[PDB]
Amino acid sequence: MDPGTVLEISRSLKKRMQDILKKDNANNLEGRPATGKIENVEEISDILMSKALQESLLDEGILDEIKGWLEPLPDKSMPNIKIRKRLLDVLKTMKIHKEHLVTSGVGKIVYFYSINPKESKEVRASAKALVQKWTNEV
C-alpha cells in the first residue's frame, strides 16, 4: 500500500462526509427529509474505523466532519439517533490527541450530548464516557 494512495482515500472520505452533510442541511433548510447521513453512516463508519487509515484521517482533520455530522441541523433538531450512536462509537476507537480536539472542537458537541436531557440513556452514557476519556487523556 502506497502512502500517497492512503492520503487520497482519506481526503476522498472527508469530501464525501462534507458533501453528504451539505445536502442534508440544504434539504432540512428547504423543509425536506435529510436522508444522506442515515443512508451512508454505516459504510462511512467502517472506513473511519480502518486501522490503516486512522492516523491519516485524523491528520486530514476528519474530526471537523464528524463534528458537523453530530451537530444540530439548521432547524435546531438533532441528527437521527442511528448517526448519534454510531459516530460516538467511532470516536471512542480513535487515538485522538489533545491537538486534534483543540483544532476541531468536536469536544463541544460531544459534551452537549453528555448533558442533553432529551438524549437516550445509552447515547448520553457513551458521550459521558468519551468526555471522561478525553479528559483522562488530556
Partner: peptide
C-alpha cells in the same frame, strides 16, 4: 485560556437546542 476551555468550550455552545 485553559486547555479544558479550548476543547470543551464553556459548555453552553449548543444550549440553544434545548431552549428551542
Amino acid at each position: 485560556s485553559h486547555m479544558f476551555f479550548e476543547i470543551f468550550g464553556t459548555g453552553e455552545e449548543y444550549r440553544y437546542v434545548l431552549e428551542s
